[PDB]
Amino acid sequence: SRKFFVGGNWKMNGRKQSLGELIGTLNAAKVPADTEVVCAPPTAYIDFARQKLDPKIAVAAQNCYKVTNGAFTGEISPGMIKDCGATWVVLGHSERRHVFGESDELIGQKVAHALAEGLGVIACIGEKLDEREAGITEKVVFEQTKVIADNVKDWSKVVLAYEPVWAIGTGKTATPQQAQEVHEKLRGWLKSNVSDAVAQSTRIIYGGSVTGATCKELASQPDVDGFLVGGASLKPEFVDIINAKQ
Amino acid sequence: RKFFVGGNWKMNGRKQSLGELIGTLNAAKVPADTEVVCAPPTAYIDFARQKLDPKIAVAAQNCYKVTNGAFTGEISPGMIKDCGATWVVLGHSERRHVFGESDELIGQKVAHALAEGLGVIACIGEKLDEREAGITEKVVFEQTKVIADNVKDWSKVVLAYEPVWAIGTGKTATPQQAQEVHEKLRGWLKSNVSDAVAQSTRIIYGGSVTGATCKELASQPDVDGFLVGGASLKPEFVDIINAKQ
């Protein structure tokens, strides 16, 4: 039975005072025991957020590199993340892939290293507008999932996040049916390419636009296991999203 | 020109080892003629500022070019200042040559950081191929150009020359070779900005520096300090702070 998972990707937003208020609201809110909640603060505030957040909520780094220490000015390692009290890391997020040009190869190595170091991974996949209006959605997300899977030895520690990058900022927007469509096929891919145990147990979360209005219908989809929330994770709304199965 | 010694910790350390390193630095007697800056890993900017004595300033190792936004994994000058840090390192060879950062992106970062009230340590340098084809001056003057295009007040900037050609390549830089490049750079500032800016701007050496080698490098006319790699994680960093004494 797959536990509902809600992640809040704060992206590059907030300062200690505003994130402190955001944190105070989440601390006061009543988290249902059957939801797994994780917040991903900016990299300068991993330590601060873990200090202020109630232990019921976990902390995720937004990125990491693929060795434990080294000559990588501006990077951080899984060792440092864990040292700050964080237990997750988001990898392959659309912004890393498409603004900062991170390759599938690089992303795969980060996943292997992150898991070796004891961290949970929220691994992100998704196709762009040009790729979808062209019929290669499956080709693109399956190859992305394959590189991740090729670098996973224990799926208990892994959550997959589908991001419809095609429906981010481009004018388009995606339906719950379209979301469910991808999630269903990803779960089939797991079954066929890894194992049936992995297919049934692995949380596949939806990373496209989520709001307090849209979340119940999206969460009711039988292969949608929760959310990786962007903008709404900075708002009181996020509490409603946590409660999308209540 | 105030002697300037920056310690780039790169992606190294944890709270225990970095606390120990900071304890050593807090206990160290910094000379009156010397300004000291430490650049921790991004996850530890906050931790480092809290533990470090006020005599030592803190730098971020990189930042992005807007104050907030949809840039998962990045930080802004606003957040860096919010954590008590007063500098950012920009255009480090590792950002340019491992992570593919353009001069265009680097210059925009420089403009944004300065506009937001941070100091900038702006890094330049040529690779071995570029050096062997005789285009050291061209590569390095052009990188300085883009930095200069985005600097209105040089009081807040330090220029760092990185001989990337001498990193794991089979070649190394002599102090005379270092001095050669630094003197050319001070001439660029004089020629293209002002004689006042040439005379007041620290140009620091970002190639291999140790306790053994720092005195001879520091004694060079146009070397005004260091951006230290590996030696920044050890007590030996203090010898380098002491390079002019």
Short mmCIF file of all heavy atoms in Angstrom, two decimals, chain A residues 58-122:
data_model
loop_
_atom_site.label_atom_id
_atom_site.label_comp_id
_atom_site.label_asym_id
_atom_site.label_seq_id
_atom_site.Cartn_x
_atom_site.Cartn_y
_atom_site.Cartn_z
N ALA A 58 10.19 16.40 6.61
CA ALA A 58 11.61 16.16 6.26
C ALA A 58 12.13 17.30 5.41
O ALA A 58 11.38 18.03 4.82
CB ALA A 58 11.76 14.86 5.51
N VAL A 59 13.45 17.40 5.31
CA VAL A 59 14.09 18.43 4.47
C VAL A 59 14.86 17.78 3.32
O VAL A 59 15.55 16.75 3.49
CB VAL A 59 15.00 19.34 5.34
CG1 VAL A 59 15.79 20.34 4.50
CG2 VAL A 59 14.14 20.07 6.36
N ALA A 60 14.73 18.38 2.13
CA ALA A 60 15.40 17.94 0.92
C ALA A 60 16.31 19.06 0.40
O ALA A 60 15.88 20.19 0.30
CB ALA A 60 14.38 17.62 -0.13
N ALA A 61 17.54 18.73 0.02
CA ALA A 61 18.30 19.59 -0.87
C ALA A 61 17.70 19.62 -2.29
O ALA A 61 17.04 18.67 -2.70
CB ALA A 61 19.76 19.16 -0.93
N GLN A 62 17.93 20.72 -3.01
CA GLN A 62 17.40 20.95 -4.37
C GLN A 62 18.31 20.40 -5.51
O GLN A 62 17.91 20.32 -6.68
CB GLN A 62 17.15 22.46 -4.56
CG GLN A 62 15.97 23.00 -3.78
CD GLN A 62 15.70 24.48 -3.97
OE1 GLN A 62 16.35 25.16 -4.77
NE2 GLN A 62 14.71 24.99 -3.26
N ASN A 63 19.52 19.99 -5.14
CA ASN A 63 20.50 19.47 -6.06
C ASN A 63 21.70 19.02 -5.21
O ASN A 63 21.79 19.34 -4.02
CB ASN A 63 20.95 20.56 -7.08
CG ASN A 63 21.62 20.00 -8.33
OD1 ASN A 63 21.51 18.81 -8.66
ND2 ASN A 63 22.35 20.85 -9.02
N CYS A 64 22.57 18.23 -5.83
CA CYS A 64 23.85 17.83 -5.27
C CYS A 64 24.75 17.36 -6.40
O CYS A 64 24.32 17.26 -7.56
CB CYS A 64 23.69 16.76 -4.19
SG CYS A 64 23.33 15.08 -4.79
N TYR A 65 26.01 17.10 -6.08
CA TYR A 65 26.97 16.58 -7.03
C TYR A 65 27.23 15.09 -6.77
O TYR A 65 26.61 14.51 -5.90
CB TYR A 65 28.26 17.42 -7.04
CG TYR A 65 29.05 17.30 -8.31
CD1 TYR A 65 28.48 17.62 -9.54
CD2 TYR A 65 30.37 16.85 -8.30
CE1 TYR A 65 29.19 17.50 -10.72
CE2 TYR A 65 31.09 16.73 -9.46
CZ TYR A 65 30.51 17.05 -10.68
OH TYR A 65 31.23 16.92 -11.82
N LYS A 66 28.16 14.49 -7.52
CA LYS A 66 28.29 13.03 -7.66
C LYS A 66 29.56 12.40 -7.01
O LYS A 66 29.87 11.22 -7.28
CB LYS A 66 28.24 12.69 -9.14
CG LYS A 66 29.33 13.36 -9.98
CD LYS A 66 29.57 12.65 -11.28
CE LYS A 66 30.75 13.24 -12.02
NZ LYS A 66 30.98 12.46 -13.26
N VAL A 67 30.28 13.18 -6.20
CA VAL A 67 31.35 12.67 -5.34
C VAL A 67 31.22 13.30 -3.93
O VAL A 67 30.47 14.26 -3.72
CB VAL A 67 32.76 12.89 -5.96
CG1 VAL A 67 32.89 12.11 -7.24
CG2 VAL A 67 33.04 14.36 -6.22
N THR A 68 31.92 12.71 -2.96
CA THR A 68 31.74 13.08 -1.58
C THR A 68 32.43 14.42 -1.21
O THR A 68 31.96 15.17 -0.35
CB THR A 68 32.18 11.92 -0.66
OG1 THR A 68 31.56 12.07 0.61
CG2 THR A 68 33.71 11.84 -0.52
N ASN A 69 33.57 14.68 -1.84
CA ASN A 69 34.29 15.95 -1.68
C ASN A 69 35.08 16.17 -2.95
O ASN A 69 35.40 15.21 -3.67
CB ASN A 69 35.26 15.93 -0.47
CG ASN A 69 34.56 15.88 0.88
OD1 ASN A 69 33.92 16.86 1.30
ND2 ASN A 69 34.66 14.75 1.56
N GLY A 70 35.44 17.42 -3.23
CA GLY A 70 36.32 17.68 -4.34
C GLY A 70 36.35 19.10 -4.85
O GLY A 70 35.74 20.02 -4.27
N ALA A 71 37.02 19.25 -5.97
CA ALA A 71 37.34 20.53 -6.55
C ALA A 71 36.20 20.96 -7.45
O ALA A 71 36.34 21.01 -8.67
CB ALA A 71 38.62 20.42 -7.36
N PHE A 72 35.07 21.25 -6.80
CA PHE A 72 33.83 21.62 -7.45
C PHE A 72 33.23 22.83 -6.76
O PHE A 72 32.17 22.75 -6.12
CB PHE A 72 32.88 20.40 -7.50
CG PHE A 72 33.51 19.25 -8.22
CD1 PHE A 72 34.06 18.20 -7.50
CD2 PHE A 72 33.69 19.29 -9.61
CE1 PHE A 72 34.71 17.17 -8.17
CE2 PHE A 72 34.32 18.25 -10.28
CZ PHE A 72 34.86 17.20 -9.54
N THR A 73 33.91 23.95 -6.95
CA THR A 73 33.52 25.25 -6.41
C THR A 73 32.04 25.48 -6.78
O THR A 73 31.66 25.31 -7.93
CB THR A 73 34.43 26.37 -6.99
OG1 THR A 73 35.75 26.21 -6.47
CG2 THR A 73 33.98 27.74 -6.61
N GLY A 74 31.22 25.81 -5.78
CA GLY A 74 29.76 26.01 -5.97
C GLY A 74 28.83 24.82 -5.85
O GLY A 74 27.58 24.97 -5.94
N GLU A 75 29.39 23.63 -5.65
CA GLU A 75 28.57 22.43 -5.48
C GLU A 75 28.45 22.02 -4.02
O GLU A 75 29.24 22.45 -3.19
CB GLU A 75 29.19 21.29 -6.30
CG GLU A 75 29.26 21.56 -7.81
CD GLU A 75 27.88 21.76 -8.45
OE1 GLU A 75 27.06 20.84 -8.36
OE2 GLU A 75 27.62 22.84 -9.04
N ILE A 76 27.51 21.14 -3.73
CA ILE A 76 27.48 20.41 -2.45
C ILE A 76 27.31 18.89 -2.65
O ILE A 76 26.75 18.43 -3.67
CB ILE A 76 26.38 20.91 -1.50
CG1 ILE A 76 24.97 20.67 -2.07
CG2 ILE A 76 26.57 22.40 -1.19
CD1 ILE A 76 23.86 20.96 -1.09
N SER A 77 27.79 18.11 -1.67
CA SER A 77 27.70 16.64 -1.77
C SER A 77 26.58 16.09 -0.87
O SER A 77 26.20 16.74 0.08
CB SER A 77 29.02 15.98 -1.41
OG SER A 77 29.31 16.15 -0.05
N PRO A 78 26.08 14.87 -1.14
CA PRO A 78 25.16 14.16 -0.21
C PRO A 78 25.63 14.07 1.25
O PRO A 78 24.82 14.13 2.20
CB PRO A 78 25.09 12.77 -0.84
CG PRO A 78 25.14 13.06 -2.28
CD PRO A 78 26.17 14.15 -2.42
N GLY A 79 26.93 13.92 1.45
CA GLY A 79 27.51 13.96 2.78
C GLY A 79 27.18 15.24 3.52
O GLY A 79 26.87 15.19 4.70
N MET A 80 27.24 16.38 2.83
CA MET A 80 26.98 17.67 3.48
C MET A 80 25.49 17.81 3.78
O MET A 80 25.09 18.37 4.79
CB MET A 80 27.42 18.83 2.60
CG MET A 80 28.92 18.85 2.31
SD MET A 80 29.33 20.08 1.05
CE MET A 80 31.12 19.90 0.92
N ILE A 81 24.69 17.30 2.87
CA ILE A 81 23.23 17.38 2.99
C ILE A 81 22.80 16.64 4.24
O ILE A 81 22.05 17.16 5.07
CB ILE A 81 22.57 16.84 1.69
CG1 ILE A 81 22.83 17.82 0.55
CG2 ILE A 81 21.08 16.64 1.91
CD1 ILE A 81 22.58 17.26 -0.83
N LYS A 82 23.31 15.44 4.39
CA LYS A 82 23.01 14.58 5.53
C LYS A 82 23.55 15.17 6.83
O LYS A 82 22.90 15.12 7.87
CB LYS A 82 23.61 13.20 5.28
CG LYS A 82 23.06 12.10 6.16
CD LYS A 82 23.39 10.72 5.59
CE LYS A 82 24.79 10.25 5.95
NZ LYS A 82 24.76 9.30 7.10
N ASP A 83 24.75 15.74 6.75
CA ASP A 83 25.36 16.49 7.85
C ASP A 83 24.48 17.66 8.35
O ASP A 83 24.45 17.93 9.56
CB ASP A 83 26.77 16.96 7.43
CG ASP A 83 27.55 17.62 8.55
OD1 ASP A 83 27.77 16.99 9.60
OD2 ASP A 83 28.03 18.76 8.32
N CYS A 84 23.77 18.33 7.43
CA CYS A 84 22.79 19.38 7.81
C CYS A 84 21.43 18.85 8.32
O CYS A 84 20.55 19.64 8.69
CB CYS A 84 22.54 20.34 6.65
SG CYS A 84 23.98 21.36 6.25
N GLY A 85 21.25 17.53 8.32
CA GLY A 85 20.07 16.90 8.93
C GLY A 85 18.97 16.62 7.92
O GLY A 85 17.88 16.20 8.30
N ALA A 86 19.27 16.84 6.64
CA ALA A 86 18.35 16.59 5.54
C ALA A 86 18.44 15.13 5.16
O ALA A 86 19.50 14.52 5.26
CB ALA A 86 18.70 17.47 4.35
N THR A 87 17.32 14.57 4.72
CA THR A 87 17.28 13.16 4.37
C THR A 87 16.89 12.90 2.93
O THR A 87 16.88 11.74 2.52
CB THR A 87 16.33 12.40 5.34
OG1 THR A 87 15.07 13.08 5.41
CG2 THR A 87 16.91 12.34 6.72
N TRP A 88 16.61 13.94 2.13
CA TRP A 88 16.29 13.78 0.71
C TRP A 88 17.10 14.70 -0.17
O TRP A 88 17.68 15.68 0.31
CB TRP A 88 14.81 14.08 0.45
CG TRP A 88 13.88 13.14 1.07
CD1 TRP A 88 13.37 13.21 2.32
CD2 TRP A 88 13.31 11.98 0.46
NE1 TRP A 88 12.53 12.15 2.56
CE2 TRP A 88 12.45 11.39 1.42
CE3 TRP A 88 13.42 11.38 -0.80
CZ2 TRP A 88 11.74 10.21 1.16
CZ3 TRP A 88 12.69 10.21 -1.07
CH2 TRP A 88 11.87 9.65 -0.09
N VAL A 89 17.11 14.39 -1.46
CA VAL A 89 17.65 15.29 -2.49
C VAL A 89 16.83 15.17 -3.76
O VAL A 89 16.55 14.05 -4.23
CB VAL A 89 19.17 15.09 -2.77
CG1 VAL A 89 19.50 13.66 -3.21
CG2 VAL A 89 19.68 16.12 -3.79
N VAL A 90 16.45 16.32 -4.31
CA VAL A 90 15.77 16.39 -5.60
C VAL A 90 16.82 16.34 -6.70
O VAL A 90 17.74 17.18 -6.71
CB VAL A 90 14.92 17.68 -5.75
CG1 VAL A 90 14.13 17.63 -7.06
CG2 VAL A 90 14.01 17.88 -4.57
N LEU A 91 16.69 15.38 -7.64
CA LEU A 91 17.62 15.27 -8.77
C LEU A 91 16.91 15.23 -10.11
O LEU A 91 15.81 14.70 -10.23
CB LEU A 91 18.50 14.02 -8.62
CG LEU A 91 19.49 14.08 -7.46
CD1 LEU A 91 20.16 12.72 -7.25
CD2 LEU A 91 20.54 15.16 -7.71
N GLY A 92 17.56 15.83 -11.10
CA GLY A 92 17.04 15.92 -12.44
C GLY A 92 15.86 16.85 -12.65
O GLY A 92 15.12 16.70 -13.64
N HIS A 93 15.67 17.82 -11.75
CA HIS A 93 14.55 18.77 -11.87
C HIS A 93 14.64 19.48 -13.20
O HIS A 93 15.72 19.77 -13.68
CB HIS A 93 14.55 19.80 -10.75
CG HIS A 93 13.30 20.62 -10.69
ND1 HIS A 93 13.14 21.78 -11.42
CD2 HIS A 93 12.14 20.43 -10.02
CE1 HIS A 93 11.94 22.27 -11.19
NE2 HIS A 93 11.32 21.49 -10.32
N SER A 94 13.49 19.77 -13.81
CA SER A 94 13.45 20.35 -15.17
C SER A 94 14.35 21.58 -15.32
O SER A 94 14.93 21.81 -16.39
CB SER A 94 12.02 20.73 -15.52
OG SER A 94 11.46 21.49 -14.47
N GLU A 95 14.45 22.38 -14.27
CA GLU A 95 15.27 23.58 -14.32
C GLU A 95 16.77 23.24 -14.38
O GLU A 95 17.54 23.91 -15.08
CB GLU A 95 14.90 24.51 -13.17
CG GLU A 95 13.54 25.19 -13.41
CD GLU A 95 12.73 25.44 -12.15
OE1 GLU A 95 13.31 25.47 -11.03
OE2 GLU A 95 11.49 25.63 -12.27
N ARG A 96 17.17 22.17 -13.68
CA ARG A 96 18.55 21.68 -13.75
C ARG A 96 18.87 21.18 -15.16
O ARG A 96 19.92 21.50 -15.72
CB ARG A 96 18.81 20.54 -12.76
CG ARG A 96 18.80 20.84 -11.25
CD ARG A 96 19.45 22.13 -10.79
NE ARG A 96 20.81 22.44 -11.25
CZ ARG A 96 21.41 23.62 -11.08
NH1 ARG A 96 20.77 24.62 -10.47
NH2 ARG A 96 22.64 23.82 -11.53
N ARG A 97 17.93 20.40 -15.72
CA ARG A 97 18.10 19.82 -17.05
C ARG A 97 18.14 20.90 -18.14
O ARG A 97 19.01 20.86 -19.00
CB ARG A 97 17.01 18.78 -17.35
CG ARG A 97 17.02 17.51 -16.50
CD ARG A 97 15.82 16.62 -16.85
NE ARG A 97 15.73 15.38 -16.08
CZ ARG A 97 16.27 14.20 -16.41
NH1 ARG A 97 17.02 14.04 -17.50
NH2 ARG A 97 16.10 13.15 -15.62
N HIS A 98 17.21 21.86 -18.09
CA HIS A 98 16.95 22.73 -19.25
C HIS A 98 17.47 24.16 -19.18
O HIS A 98 17.72 24.75 -20.23
CB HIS A 98 15.46 22.70 -19.57
CG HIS A 98 14.99 21.32 -19.87
ND1 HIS A 98 14.06 20.65 -19.09
CD2 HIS A 98 15.39 20.43 -20.81
CE1 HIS A 98 13.89 19.43 -19.57
NE2 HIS A 98 14.69 19.27 -20.61
N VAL A 99 17.64 24.71 -17.99
CA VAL A 99 18.34 25.97 -17.82
C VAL A 99 19.84 25.71 -17.64
O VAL A 99 20.65 26.37 -18.24
CB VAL A 99 17.82 26.78 -16.61
CG1 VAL A 99 18.46 28.16 -16.58
CG2 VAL A 99 16.29 26.93 -16.68
N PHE A 100 20.18 24.74 -16.80
CA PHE A 100 21.59 24.50 -16.46
C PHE A 100 22.23 23.32 -17.20
O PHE A 100 23.42 23.05 -17.02
CB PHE A 100 21.73 24.41 -14.94
CG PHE A 100 21.30 25.68 -14.26
CD1 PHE A 100 20.05 25.78 -13.67
CD2 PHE A 100 22.10 26.81 -14.33
CE1 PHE A 100 19.64 26.99 -13.09
CE2 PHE A 100 21.70 28.01 -13.78
CZ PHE A 100 20.46 28.11 -13.16
N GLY A 101 21.46 22.67 -18.07
CA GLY A 101 22.01 21.73 -19.05
C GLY A 101 22.54 20.42 -18.49
O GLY A 101 23.43 19.81 -19.09
N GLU A 102 21.99 19.98 -17.36
CA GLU A 102 22.46 18.72 -16.76
C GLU A 102 22.02 17.51 -17.61
O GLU A 102 20.84 17.36 -17.93
CB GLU A 102 21.98 18.58 -15.31
CG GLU A 102 22.59 19.62 -14.37
CD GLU A 102 22.38 19.34 -12.90
OE1 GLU A 102 21.96 18.23 -12.50
OE2 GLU A 102 22.65 20.27 -12.11
N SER A 103 23.00 16.68 -17.97
CA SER A 103 22.77 15.50 -18.82
C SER A 103 22.21 14.33 -18.03
O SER A 103 22.39 14.24 -16.83
CB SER A 103 24.09 15.08 -19.49
OG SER A 103 24.96 14.46 -18.56
N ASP A 104 21.52 13.43 -18.74
CA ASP A 104 21.07 12.18 -18.17
C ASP A 104 22.20 11.40 -17.51
O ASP A 104 22.02 10.89 -16.42
CB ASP A 104 20.38 11.30 -19.23
CG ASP A 104 19.01 11.80 -19.58
OD1 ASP A 104 18.10 11.71 -18.72
OD2 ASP A 104 18.84 12.28 -20.72
N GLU A 105 23.36 11.34 -18.17
CA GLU A 105 24.57 10.68 -17.63
C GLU A 105 24.96 11.25 -16.25
O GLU A 105 25.11 10.50 -15.27
CB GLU A 105 25.74 10.85 -18.60
CG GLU A 105 26.94 9.94 -18.30
CD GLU A 105 28.25 10.47 -18.86
OE1 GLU A 105 28.85 11.37 -18.23
OE2 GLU A 105 28.68 9.98 -19.92
N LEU A 106 25.11 12.57 -16.19
CA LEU A 106 25.43 13.26 -14.93
C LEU A 106 24.36 13.00 -13.87
O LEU A 106 24.69 12.66 -12.73
CB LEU A 106 25.54 14.76 -15.17
CG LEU A 106 26.49 15.59 -14.29
CD1 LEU A 106 25.94 17.00 -14.18
CD2 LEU A 106 26.85 15.00 -12.93
N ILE A 107 23.09 13.14 -14.25
CA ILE A 107 21.97 12.91 -13.33
C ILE A 107 21.98 11.49 -12.78
O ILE A 107 21.74 11.30 -11.59
CB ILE A 107 20.60 13.25 -13.99
CG1 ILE A 107 20.53 14.76 -14.25
CG2 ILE A 107 19.43 12.85 -13.09
CD1 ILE A 107 19.50 15.18 -15.27
N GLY A 108 22.27 10.51 -13.63
CA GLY A 108 22.40 9.13 -13.19
C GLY A 108 23.50 8.92 -12.16
O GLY A 108 23.34 8.20 -11.19
N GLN A 109 24.64 9.57 -12.37
CA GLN A 109 25.74 9.43 -11.41
C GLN A 109 25.41 10.06 -10.06
O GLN A 109 25.81 9.56 -9.02
CB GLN A 109 27.00 10.06 -11.98
CG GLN A 109 27.51 9.31 -13.20
CD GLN A 109 28.44 10.13 -14.07
OE1 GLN A 109 28.32 11.36 -14.16
NE2 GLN A 109 29.34 9.46 -14.74
N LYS A 110 24.67 11.17 -10.10
CA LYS A 110 24.26 11.82 -8.87
C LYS A 110 23.33 10.91 -8.12
O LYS A 110 23.44 10.80 -6.92
CB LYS A 110 23.57 13.17 -9.13
CG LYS A 110 24.46 14.22 -9.77
CD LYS A 110 23.63 15.45 -10.11
CE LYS A 110 24.48 16.62 -10.52
NZ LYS A 110 23.72 17.89 -10.29
N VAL A 111 22.40 10.26 -8.83
CA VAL A 111 21.47 9.32 -8.17
C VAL A 111 22.23 8.17 -7.48
O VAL A 111 21.99 7.89 -6.31
CB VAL A 111 20.39 8.81 -9.16
CG1 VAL A 111 19.65 7.59 -8.62
CG2 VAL A 111 19.40 9.94 -9.44
N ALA A 112 23.16 7.54 -8.20
CA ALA A 112 23.95 6.42 -7.65
C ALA A 112 24.70 6.87 -6.40
O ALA A 112 24.60 6.23 -5.35
CB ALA A 112 24.93 5.90 -8.68
N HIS A 113 25.39 8.02 -6.48
CA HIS A 113 26.13 8.54 -5.32
C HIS A 113 25.22 8.92 -4.16
O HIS A 113 25.52 8.60 -3.01
CB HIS A 113 27.01 9.74 -5.67
CG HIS A 113 27.85 10.20 -4.51
ND1 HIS A 113 27.84 11.49 -4.04
CD2 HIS A 113 28.67 9.50 -3.69
CE1 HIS A 113 28.64 11.58 -2.99
NE2 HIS A 113 29.15 10.39 -2.75
N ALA A 114 24.13 9.62 -4.46
CA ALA A 114 23.19 10.03 -3.42
C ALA A 114 22.64 8.86 -2.61
O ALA A 114 22.58 8.91 -1.38
CB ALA A 114 22.05 10.83 -4.02
N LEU A 115 22.26 7.81 -3.31
CA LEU A 115 21.68 6.62 -2.65
C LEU A 115 22.74 5.84 -1.87
O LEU A 115 22.49 5.40 -0.75
CB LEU A 115 21.01 5.72 -3.70
CG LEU A 115 19.72 6.31 -4.26
CD1 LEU A 115 19.34 5.62 -5.56
CD2 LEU A 115 18.59 6.22 -3.26
N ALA A 116 23.93 5.73 -2.44
CA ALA A 116 25.07 5.13 -1.73
C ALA A 116 25.36 5.81 -0.38
O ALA A 116 25.67 5.14 0.62
CB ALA A 116 26.29 5.13 -2.62
N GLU A 117 25.19 7.13 -0.34
CA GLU A 117 25.42 7.92 0.87
C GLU A 117 24.29 7.92 1.92
O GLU A 117 24.45 8.50 2.99
CB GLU A 117 25.81 9.34 0.47
CG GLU A 117 27.19 9.42 -0.14
CD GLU A 117 28.29 9.34 0.90
OE1 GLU A 117 28.41 10.28 1.71
OE2 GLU A 117 29.02 8.32 0.93
N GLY A 118 23.18 7.25 1.64
CA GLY A 118 22.10 7.08 2.62
C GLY A 118 20.92 8.02 2.46
O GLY A 118 20.01 8.01 3.29
N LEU A 119 20.94 8.82 1.39
CA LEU A 119 19.88 9.80 1.11
C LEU A 119 18.73 9.18 0.33
O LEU A 119 18.94 8.28 -0.48
CB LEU A 119 20.43 10.99 0.30
CG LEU A 119 20.52 12.38 0.94
CD1 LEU A 119 20.83 12.40 2.43
CD2 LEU A 119 21.50 13.27 0.17
N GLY A 120 17.52 9.69 0.57
CA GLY A 120 16.41 9.44 -0.34
C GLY A 120 16.55 10.34 -1.56
O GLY A 120 17.08 11.46 -1.45
N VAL A 121 16.08 9.87 -2.71
CA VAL A 121 16.06 10.68 -3.93
C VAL A 121 14.65 10.89 -4.47
O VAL A 121 13.88 9.94 -4.57
CB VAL A 121 16.95 10.08 -5.03
CG1 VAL A 121 16.86 10.87 -6.33
CG2 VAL A 121 18.38 10.02 -4.55
N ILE A 122 14.32 12.15 -4.78
CA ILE A 122 13.16 12.52 -5.60
C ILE A 122 13.72 12.74 -7.01
O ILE A 122 14.28 13.79 -7.32
CB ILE A 122 12.44 13.80 -5.10
CG1 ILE A 122 12.03 13.67 -3.63
CG2 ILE A 122 11.24 14.15 -5.98
CD1 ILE A 122 11.74 14.98 -2.93
#
